[PDB]
Design goal:
Order of helices and strands of chain A: HHH
Distance between the termini of chain A: 42 Å
Bound molecules: copper (I) ion
Structural class of chain A: mainly alpha
Organism of A, B: Escherichia coli
Chains A, B: Cation efflux system protein CusA
Radius of gyration of chain A: 17 Å
Keywords: efflux, pump, heavy metal. copper, silver, closed, open, transporter, membrane protein, MEMBRANE PROTEIN- TRANSPORT PROTEIN complex
Number of strands of chain A: 0
PDB class: membrane protein/ transport protein
Oligomer: part of a larger assembly
Entry title: Cryo-electron microscopy structure of the heavy metal efflux pump CusA in a heterogeneous 1 open and 2 closed protomer conformation
Shape of chain A: elongated
Chain lengths: ~50, ~50
């Protein structure tokens, strides 16, 4: 709590985690949200507009 | 003979995710018969007509 209250700079959203958990989450290149909708296509514009 | 009377690929056009070959060759009028190949014009580096 004191760490979060001390470090305050514009443009940052603080997160305080364990090192090992942070590394595992950084290497985990999956989907974190409960539900995920993947829209795949041949170009970026169509899938974005979709 | 590999390209003019051939048609070997020289590159690929990229369109988003698709890749289409690019050809290079003379017309068909210079491909029908061996006599048509005996007269296949070539422009030697000396800029002569052979
Ligand atoms: Cu990170």
């Amino acid at each position: 709590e004191e760490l979060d209250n001390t470090v305050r700079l514009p443009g940052l959203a603080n997160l305080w985690v364990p090192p090992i958990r942070n590394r595992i989450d950084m290497l985990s290149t999956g989907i974190k949200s409960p539900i995920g909708i993947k829209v795949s296509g041949t170009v970026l514009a169509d899938i974005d507009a979709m | 003979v590999t390209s003019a009377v051939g048609g070997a690929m020289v590159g690929e056009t990229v369109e988003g995710i698709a890749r289409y070959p690019i050809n290079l060759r003379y017309p068909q009028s210079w491909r029908d018969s061996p006599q048509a190949l005996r007269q296949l014009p070539i422009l030697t580096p000396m800029k002569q007509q052979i």
